[PDB]
Nucleic acid binder design. Structure first.
Ligand SMILES: O=c1ccn([C@@H]2O[C@H](COP(=O)(O)OP(=O)(O)OP(=O)(O)O)[C@@H](O)[C@H]2O)c(=O)[nH]1
Ligand SMILES: [Mg+2]
Ligand SMILES: [Mg+2]
Ligand SMILES: [Mg+2]
Ligand SMILES: [Zn+2]
Lengths: 105, 1114, 263, 80, 93, 221, 43
DNA sequence: CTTGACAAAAGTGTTAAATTGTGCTATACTGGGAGCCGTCACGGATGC
DNA sequence: GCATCCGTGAGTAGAGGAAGCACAATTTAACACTTTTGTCAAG
């Protein structure tokens, strides 16, 4: 529709960073060592970053396209396309503030 | 076919063993066969005695002796099962309790040491490897001038690599002599006080110079006690740590006096004694005993520095690129260095184990864990820069690989930070390092070759032989000397005329410290052995080298390594004389051990009964695949009942003909332009070469597949593959493997395999399709191995390894592995690369039928046409002289040996051409034929060009043209002669490894990358071509906006665009408009991870969403 | 975090840098809730600042963070965008592309200035979607899917396929490129002529602009797809339309070597 | 004022083209604090976004040209 | 060299305008199946096939030949673009 | 404890947590010194932190202890046999409940992932990640055959009646993406369950009859 | 390249950079070493 | 098109067995360890 | 005027490449049983 005519770059506030994210990463876990599935609250969680295959939740209650825009009430995973996993961000809440090294060195 | 030899110089010694740099160094390190009590303190024996004994500080672990066991598997078994050819190592240790006095001895297993093959290589994980020698600066004491300020010098002390820090001694402008250690500069008097030096001692010896000694006479620290000075020095070295004497003496003693930490080296100690004129007891800077430090080298180094600055006649600066200051580390030393590294780690785990856990009940075996030692050795032989994949395209390739010298590697220089001076040809390179053989590009001058007569001595310095000259007569006594020793004499050239042993010339060309001079015979002290000692083995194989420019001689010697073996390979018509020794030392052929009689001859083995009565059977390697894919086999050359002498040839190896190196063919060459098919190095050949199987070679390719255990189920190698017709499964046997002898083409199945399908419900459209035809979906899918595009041939071998087989170490989860070998026979074709020994190369551009080729008046056509425009600007005239001599041999039926710089000259070549004309033309007259009408026309022009003498008869003028290497040549297309006489002769041409069959590739669509979603790279991956920045600039300068946009979006990473473009074309439509590339979306996300807000706007500054709303929180 | 064909896993360096920061952040929370002394708390906070520095820009301040058992520094976000190997110069200013090939070059003296010689085998792969449509238009294949199976196996390709490939390329041009591309004449457009063999035939008079000869040189091939792309290549980029030098204005395609010698 | 080619190119108005040349950290940190806006004027900026470059056939001087035949032109003008 | 390239370059003020006119005309021919051509039957480009002579399938070749006859009109702001395609589609369904 | 997956400063901070716990539980009535008791708690915290943070793919504490015991056993057998043991020797020394299959599975679990950024070769312009294809997004070839199949399936369904096609699409799941029960289709049209079965089966017979007369649908199978 | 007035829309900046840079590179690959390339860079 | 069936495929508690998470150990023990120069050379910008 | 710090160095191709133990919480698998859903035979 609309065409891109300009690109702007600026600083990001803490309040803007929290509006980007779909959840907070609380654990350093990647995946289960036996089932090879992402762990809850980890760096690959489906409830934050989206489903791994199209229109399929973690628990398996939903498996088809008809429930588009729906969130499972059991696993908490949105039923949508798996390509959102390239675009959805998370965030980490620090216990104490830290400086950005670009604006220091 | 007889052989004629030229030359005058008589060599007094033959060439040394050409692989002795590898073989002799690794034997000295191992000392495998020397009895333990007679072993000398070198190699790994010296490493055992350096780390041991290990003391807790009351438990002592000591070393007694070691031994090496027999290898577990033979060499051919290791190659087939991907093993390492090695031997177990055992150490005999004893534990002593100091408090009690009880001793226990046992033998502990330490691991495996790789073993070197007879030709000088290793088998690491089933692959052949070569350890390349390293050159580096020798340790010692050196004096160089100050670049910033004239009249000042710097003294350096350099240990072995990673065996101590460098020490600098400089006179500061203020007059204080300073010592710099680890980027920290402190006055020398502080440390010189620690060595118990007083004010009366220093001024006695160094006070004979002037103002310099005054800078060493500070009274602030002179009265200070050595213990107080020791602590003060410790604070400067590492400030912050608590000053304690127990910690202070540990740091100072461990920095310059601990033999386990500082090592000057045998070469470094020898250099220091020669220069400073002292004698060293050890290999450290200072010696610690009786609770005090005693000086060993610091005082003599300081005296040389002061006297050099003062200007005494006997002291001079050092040249760091002088070959007397550079030394070679061979395979034995490089291996032993890592053996000592891993042994120090083992002693570190022994100490932590003997002070914690069952101290009263200990055994030597329970203390020792050999895992650190095996990891050090394994890392060296696998992931070292000096351990390289062996080059074995032909036997000459592997010989050169073993004589290469590299300045790179761990502890060496870097490719990017190396300057001009380190890359130059130094004057001391003469007779030690070849001046012409080196790679062009970023590695020029950093990788070199050993000279043919050179050898590395025990300390690592290269020596070259010279003949002693006394009183004007030359003796046969030969002395090997280094560059530093060579500088003291006047050395005559090898071509100096002699009357027996007496020098005959009044004026002699000689060198004095590297520069040419003219001297009298009574001033000569040494003489060169032969011209061959200046160059390497590759350069010594080029005849008429004296007529070639060095820039083109570099190409010729390098490209002999890339020649592939031929099924009808033959030895060159013109040889230098090194062809026999190259085949002999490569160990590729088979020779008789002593006199005997041949009993059995076969294509697989030969049996010889020797005169002592014993029978020896020799198996033959047949159709073996090398690291580069070329076939290596041995062909017998004897018959049953034939008597043989000691050293007689039994079987030819690859690229050899009756014991001579054979890298190509001998062809008939004409030098003339031909219709533009010779344009800019292109080459025209005849179809007659293909008809008689010239330039035909055999290549073998290997393919592999695995059957694994998965969660869904195990993969199975089977013939029953779903949805496949009988035409596809015709050549597979009952086990799913292709039968031996089958002919395979791209798309043909080699091994059949099935895998369990992942759980995924099908798409609705497929579900209706399966309902219509009444077909039930299967639970497995096709995952078989097929021939890649552009490949194929004949199946000649299969190998099947299964879990549990003896010697087979498969990775966890792998059930079995199947390997298939495919062989093809390659004939010469358009696009193949050819070369000669003088640096002339080019690709084949045209193949002509025989009736199209130019031919001699007797009907003989030529084989190859070369453009004369490639000669003049390259200045490689050796190929012209080889052609002239090959023309004489074509009619006389003989071959020649012309050594380099002493060989065939034009008067001798013209005397041979006169004899060849008598059979080339005297034959015609007897048969009843005169002079052709067409030859009279060419002769008429030839005297207008000033080529023949006016007034002579036609027969006399044809002979005048023959002595210049020219003949009258007819055109095959018209039958009329070329208007001028053409140079025609015989030349030796090689077929190189680079063939167009292995290089042609194309792609429409294929695999894509994970993160950027762009096409992969490389033909092996079926990847696309890189369209880089400079290519984008060219499209911008053309104004092709739409062509540039397609490559950026529709053909690389616009996922939606590339799907729509493919569907439009198969429907007969024009491709649609592209969209945002995916790599730009990645850049925006990666910038957001850096807490930067990047936003795309429109004309009104309103935001534009490029993520389709997929990343917006509702 | 992907599983390779053999069952082994592969992961990026950013995952290890995130794990370090999360571990230190969680430990600081527990230490604060336990009333730890200020010496322990200050140590944790100094470690947390350094962990963030490594994630953003590893090696800018202090010693680089390395993966245990190795000395290779971990790749941070700043390393991903900067340098010759970074995101800008490697993936945005230049890319790898579809519909492209490569082979050795030989001389064709019989060609016209606007022609080149292209192997049949290369052209079959380069113009594959066009050929699939053409095969179905005739009776060679019933549909596009059946056409693609026929080309997979070499022994299943019939003689009529080569006739169809001749009508596909009628009037079209390709792009030939030799590296290094020093000026814009390192890319030129040619009308392909299908040949037997595996090497590309090049006109004698365009070798000076390419700085090309015949001792081993290789060249690349590209296919413009749309009508805009074909029209630009046939009008602006054609070899026969670029005879003078953009730098000096002197003839660049001109007689050379043996052509001069004969004349 | 006179400056060299490197300094002249790094002080350009567009941050996308300056950050893709050299000194990326310094260029990006200065643009973000100022809130700079890139107007996509030159060639490098449009290449990065995959747009049609404003040169050659992509220039506004020739980009909007129309082509029509007489039969369709007569019908439109007469009916208007 | 393309036939009549010298005359084609002389018909436009800028060489890039000629490429724009050619590319847009070829799209028109492809979209209507060559039924809107201004060429006479004896002027149609041909290609030689094993079965006989047939029409040239290359639309870019057709566009260049049509532009040499002088029967095409090109310029800026000639007609509204939506009204151009509607009439051309009605004339050539 | 250095060299086991954690940095020296990480080990120190994990040991400081054990020292805090020891202060809480220490008893001075027993007349033992503090370092005698605190050493137990300091070592435990460091050891537990190694088993929980040293691997990218976390492995439970009990399984980590099995992997460590399995490595000690193979090292002891290696120095006794003069060679690397087979899986059958390892299982026998481990004890009851262990066979060669369990040894191989445990070793497969204990494998660490490799970095995508690890170089290969000497020059630093080639990395592991450049040789790994992506197999999640469909290829351009696979996307086109999906749409070609749908277009051909739509033209075949036009030969059917209005309800025969509509019932078939609901049952097969072509409209909503999910199949619907015979009863669910019945509720949409107001008809019984068994009625759907016969009408859905009839439409299939007509499709099979046309299919044999055109062969426009077999290649997609 | 055409010996005629330049047409509006040509990227003359890119052509200038390629015209200056090309002879310097080919000369090095084939005096340009001393008082050649270094003098041009300094200017 | 509608009833009666009829077994089958799928759904639903219940529970024992693998599997995983966590606390604890009382002689006395109290500041690390690896490096280690053909250290790359030159220009620009900053701070004294 | 000088010492200190920091970023820069051509392109494409290849081809190898070291703790236990006890016990509580939690997850999973096995097993029945109830309910839902097609087929078959009428009709
Ligand atoms: O490292 C290199 C080597 C070569 N090349 C490229 O390959 C070319 C190899 O050029 P050559 O060194 O083969 O010389 P030449 O053909 O120009 O010699 P004459 O026939 O004129 O005597 C170079 O001129 C350059 O284009 C590189 O780009 N980089
Ligand atoms: Mg090279
Ligand atoms: Mg050349
Ligand atoms: Mg070349
Ligand atoms: Zn769910």
């Amino acid at each position: 529709k609309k065409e891109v005519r300009k690109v702007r770059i600026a600083l990001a506030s803490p309040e803007k960073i929290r509006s980007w994210s779909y959840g907070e990463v609380e654990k350093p876990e990647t995946i289960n060592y036996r089932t090879l599935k992402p762990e809850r609250d980890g760096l690959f969680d489906e409830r934050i970053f989206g489903p791994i295959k199209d229109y399929e939740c973690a628990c398996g209650k939903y498996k088809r396209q008809r429930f588009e825009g729906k969130v499972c009430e059991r696993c908490g995973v949105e039923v949508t396309k798996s390509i959102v996993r390239r675009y959805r961000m998370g965030h980490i809440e620090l216990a104490t503030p830290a400086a950005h090294i670009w604006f220091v060195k | 076919m007889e052989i004629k030899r030229f030359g005058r110089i008589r060599e007094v010694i033959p060439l040394p063993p050409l692989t002795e740099i590898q073989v002799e160094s690794y034997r000295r390190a191992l000392q495998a066969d020397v009895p333990p009590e007679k072993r000398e303190n070198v190699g790994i024996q010296a490493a055992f005695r350096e780390t041991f004994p290990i003391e807790e500080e009351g438990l002592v672990l000591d070393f007694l002796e070691y031994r090496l066991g027999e290898p577990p598997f033979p060499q051919d078994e290791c190659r087939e099962k991907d093993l390492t050819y090695q031997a177990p190592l055992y150490a005999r240790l004893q534990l002593i309790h100091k408090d009690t006095g009880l001793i226990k001895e046992d033998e502990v297993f330490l691991g495996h040491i790789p073993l070197m093959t007879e030709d000088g290589s290793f088998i690491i994980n089933g692959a052949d490897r070569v350890i390349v020698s390293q050159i580096h600066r020798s340790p010692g004491v050196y004096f160089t001038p100050d670049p910033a300020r004239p009249g000042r010098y710097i003294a350096s002390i350099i240990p072995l690599p990673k065996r101590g820090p460098w020490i600098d001694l400089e006179v500061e402008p203020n007059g204080v002599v300073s010592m710099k250690v680890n980027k920290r500069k402190f006055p020398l008097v502080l440390l010189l006080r620690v060595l118990g030096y007083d004010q009366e001692t220093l001024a006695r010896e160094l006070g004979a110079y002037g103002e310099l000694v005054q800078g060493l006479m500070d009274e602030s620290v002179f009265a200070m006690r050595p213990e107080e000075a020791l602590i003060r020095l410790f604070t400067l070295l590492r400030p912050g740590d608590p000053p304690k004497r127990d910690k202070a003496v540990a740091y100072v003693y461990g920095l310059i006096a601990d033999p386990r930490r500082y090592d000057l080296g045998e070469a470094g100690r020898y250099k220091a004694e020669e220069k400073l004129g002292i004698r060293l007891s050890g290999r450290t800077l200072a010696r610690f005993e009786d609770g005090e430090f005693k000086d060993e080298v610091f005082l003599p180094t300081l005296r040389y520095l002061f006297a050099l600055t003062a200007g005494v006649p006997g002291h001079e600066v050092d040249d760091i690129d002088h070959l007397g200051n550079r030394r070679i580390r061979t395979v034995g030393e490089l291996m032993t260095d890592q053996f000592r590294v891993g042994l120090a780690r083992l002693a570190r785990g022994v100490r932590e184990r003997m002070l914690m856990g069952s101290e009263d009940s200990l055994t030597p075996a329970k203390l020792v864990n050999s895992r650190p030692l095996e990891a050090a050795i394994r890392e060296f032989f696998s992931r070292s820069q000096l351990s390289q994949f062996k080059d074995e395209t032909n036997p000459l390739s592997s010989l050169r690989h073993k004589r290469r010298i590299s300045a790179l590697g761990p502890g060496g220089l870097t490719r990017e930070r190396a300057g001009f001076d380190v890359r130059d040809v130094h004057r001391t390179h003469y007779g030690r390092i070849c001046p012409v053989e080196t790679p062009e590009g970023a590695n020029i001058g950093l990788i070199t070759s050993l000279a043919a007569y050179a050898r590395v001595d025990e300390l690592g310095f290269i020596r070259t032989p010279y003949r002693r000259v006394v009183g004007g007569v030359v003796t046969d006594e030969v002395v090997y000397m280094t560059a530093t020793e060579e500088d003291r004499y006047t050395i005559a050239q090898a071509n100096t005329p002699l009357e027996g042993n007496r020098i005959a010339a009044e004026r002699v060309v000689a060198r004095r410290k590297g520069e040419p001079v003219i001297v009298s015979p009574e001033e000569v002290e040494f003489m060169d052995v032969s011209p061959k000692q200046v160059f390497s083995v590759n350069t010594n194989l080029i005849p008429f080298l004296e007529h070639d420019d060095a820039n083109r001689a570099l190409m010729g010697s390098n490209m002999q390594t890339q020649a592939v073996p031929l099924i009808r390979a033959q030895a060159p018509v013109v040889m230098t004389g090194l062809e026999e020794r190259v085949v002999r030392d490569s160990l590729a052929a088979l020779y008789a051990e002593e006199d005997g009689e041949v009993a059995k001859v076969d294509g697989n083995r030969i049996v010889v009964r020797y005169e002592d009565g014993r029978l020896v059977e020799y198996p033959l390697r047949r159709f073996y695949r090398s690291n580069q894919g070329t076939a290596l086999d041995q062909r017998p050359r004897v018959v049953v009942g034939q008597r043989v002498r000691k050293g007689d040839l039994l079987a030819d190896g690859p690229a050899s003909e009756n014991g001579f190196l054979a890298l190509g063919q001998n062809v008939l060459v004409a030098i003339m332009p031909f219709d533009g098919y010779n344009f800019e190095d292109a080459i025209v050949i005849s179809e007659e070469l293909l008809k008689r199987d010239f330039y035909t070679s055999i290549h073998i390719e290997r393919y592999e597949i695995e059957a694994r255990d998965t969660k869904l189920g195990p993969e199975r190698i089977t013939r029953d593959i779903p949805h496949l017709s009988e035409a596809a499964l015709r050549d597979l046997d009952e086990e799913g493997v292709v039968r031996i002898g089958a002919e395979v083409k791209p798309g043909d199945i080699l091994v059949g395999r099935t895998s369990f399908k992942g759980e995924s419900e099908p798409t609705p459209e497929e579900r209706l399709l399966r309902s219509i035809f009444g077909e039930k979906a299967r639970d497995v899918k096709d995952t078989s191995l097929r021939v890649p595009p552009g490949e194929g041939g004949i199946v000649v071998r299969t190998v099947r390894l299964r879990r549990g087989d003896p010697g087979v170490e498969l990775k966890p989860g792998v059930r079995e592995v199947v390997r298939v070998y495919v062989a093809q026979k390659r004939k010469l074709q358009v696009g193949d690369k050819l070369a000669n020994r003088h640096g002339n190369k080019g690709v084949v551009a045209k193949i002509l039928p025989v009736e199209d080729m130019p031919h001699l008046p007797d009907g003989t056509p030529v084989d190859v046409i070369l453009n004369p425009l490639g000669v003049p600007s390259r200045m490689n005239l050796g190929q012209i002289l080889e052609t002239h001599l090959g023309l004489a041999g074509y009619f006389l039926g003989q071959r020649y040996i012309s050594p380099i710089f002493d060989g065939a000259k034009e008067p001798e070549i013209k005397e041979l051409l006169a004899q060849a004309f008598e059979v080339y033309f005297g034959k015609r007259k007897g048969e009843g034929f005169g002079v052709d009408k067409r030859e009279v026309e060419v002769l008429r022009r030839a005297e207008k060009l000033g080529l023949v003498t006016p007034g002579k008869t036609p027969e006399e003028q044809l002979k005048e043209l023959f002595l210049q290497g020219k003949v009258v040549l007819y055109d095959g297309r018209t039958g009329e002669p070329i208007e001028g006489p053409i140079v025609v002769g015989q030349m030796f041409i090689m077929k190189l490894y680079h063939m167009v069959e292995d290089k042609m590739h194309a792609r429409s669509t294929g695999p894509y990358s994970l993160i950027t979603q762009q096409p992969l790279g490389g033909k092996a991956q079926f990847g696309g071509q890189r369209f880089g920045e400079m290519e984008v600039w060219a499209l911008e300068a053309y104004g092709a906006a739409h062509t540039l946009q397609e490559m950026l979006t529709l053909k690389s990473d616009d996922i939606e665009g590339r799907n729509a473009a493919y569907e439009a074309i198969i429907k007969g439509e024009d491709v649609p408009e592209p969209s945002v590339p995916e790599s730009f979306r990645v850049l925006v996300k990666e910038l957001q991870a850096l807490a930067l807000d990047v936003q795309t706007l429109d004309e009104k500054d309103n935001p534009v969403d490029i993520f389709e709303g997929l990343a917006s929180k509702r | 975090m992907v599983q390779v064909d053999g069952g082994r896993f592969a992961t990026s360096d950013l995952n290890d840098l995130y794990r370090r920061l999360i571990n230190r952040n969680n430990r600081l929370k527990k230490l604060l809730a336990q009333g730890a002394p200020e010496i322990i708390i200050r140590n944790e906070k100094r470690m947390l600042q350094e962990a963030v520095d490594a994630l953003l820009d590893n090696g800018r301040r202090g010693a680089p963070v390395t993966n245990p058992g190795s000395d290779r520094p971990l790749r941070s976000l700043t390393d991903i965008l900067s340098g010759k190997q970074g995101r800008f110069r490697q993936n945005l200013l230049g890319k790898r592309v579809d519909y492209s090939g490569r082979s050795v070059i030989v001389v064709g003296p019989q060609l016209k200035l606007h022609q080149c010689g292209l192997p049949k085998r290369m052209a079959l792969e380069l113009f594959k979607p066009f050929l699939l449509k053409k095969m179905e238009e005739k009776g060679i294949a019933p549909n596009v899917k059946a056409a693609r199976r026929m080309l997979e196996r070499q022994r299943d390709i019939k003689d009529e396929v080569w006739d169809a490939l001749e009508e596909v390329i009628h009037g079209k041009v390709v792009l030939l490129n030799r590296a290094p591309t020093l000026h814009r004449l390192g890319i030129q457009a040619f009308q392909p002529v299908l040949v037997e063999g595996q090497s590309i035939q090049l006109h004698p008079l365009v070798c000076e602009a390419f700085n090309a000869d015949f001792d081993g040189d290789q060249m690349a091939v590209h296919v413009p797809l749309s009508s805009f792309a074909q029209a630009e290549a046939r009008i602006q980029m054609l070899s026969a339309h670029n005879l003078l030098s953009p730098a000096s204005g002197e003839p660049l395609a001109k007689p050379s070597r043996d052509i001069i010698l004969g004349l | 004022l006179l400056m060299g080619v490197t300094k002249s190119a790094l002080s350009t108005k567009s941050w996308l083209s300056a950050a893709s040349f050299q000194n990326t950290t310094h260029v990006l940190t200065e643009a973000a604090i100022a809130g700079k806006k890139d107007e996509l004027i030159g060639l490098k900026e449009n290449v990065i976004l995959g747009r049609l470059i404003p040169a050659g056939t992509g220039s506004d001087f020739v980009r909007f040209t129309q082509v029509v035949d007489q039969k369709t032109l007569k019908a439109i003008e007469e009916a208007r | 060299a393309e036939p009549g390239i010298d005359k084609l370059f002389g018909m436009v003020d800028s060489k890039y305008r000629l490429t724009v006119v050619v590319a847009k005309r070829a799209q028109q021919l492809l979209r209507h199946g060559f039924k809107n051509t201004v060429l006479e039957p004896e002027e149609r480009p041909k290609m030689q096939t094993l079965e006989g002579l047939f029409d040239d399938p290359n639309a870019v070749t057709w566009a260049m030949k049509e532009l040499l006859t002088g029967r095409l009109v090109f310029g800026e702001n000639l007609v509204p673009e939506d009204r151009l395609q509607k009439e051309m589609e009605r004339l050539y369904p | 404890y250095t060299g086991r997956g954690l940095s020296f400063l990480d080990l120190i901070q994990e040991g400081n947590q054990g020292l805090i716990r020891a202060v809480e539980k220490f008893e001075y009535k027993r007349r033992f010194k503090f370092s005698t008791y605190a050493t137990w708690w300091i070592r435990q915290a460091i050891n537990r932190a190694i088993a929980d943070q040293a691997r990218t793919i976390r492995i439970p504490v009990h399984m980590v202890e099995t992997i460590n015991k399995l490595s000690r056993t193979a090292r002891q057998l290696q120095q006794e046999l003069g060679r690397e043991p087979t899986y059958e020797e390892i299982a026998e020394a481990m004890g009851p409940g262990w066979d060669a299959k369990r040894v191989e599975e445990t070793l497969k679990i204990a494998q660490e992932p490799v970095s995508l950024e690890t170089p290969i070769g000497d020059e630093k312009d080639s990395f592991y990640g450049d040789f790994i294809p992506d197999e999640h997004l469909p290829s351009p070839v696979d996307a086109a055959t999906q749409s070609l199949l749908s277009e051909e399936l739509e033209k075949a369904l036009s030969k059917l009646s209005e309800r025969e096609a509509m019932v078939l699409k609901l049952r097969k799941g072509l409209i909503d993406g999910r199949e619907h029960t015979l009863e669910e289709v019945g509720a949409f049209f107001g008809v019984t369950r068994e009625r759907i079965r016969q009408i859905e089966n009839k439409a299939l017979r007509k499709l099979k009859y046309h299919e044999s007369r055109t062969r426009k649908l077999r290649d997609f199978l | 390249s055409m010996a005629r007035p330049v047409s509006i829309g040509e990227a003359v900046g890119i052509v200038a950079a390629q015209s200056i840079g090309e002879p310097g590179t080919q000369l090095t690959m084939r005096a340009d070493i001393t008082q050649g390339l270094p003098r041009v860079i300094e200017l």
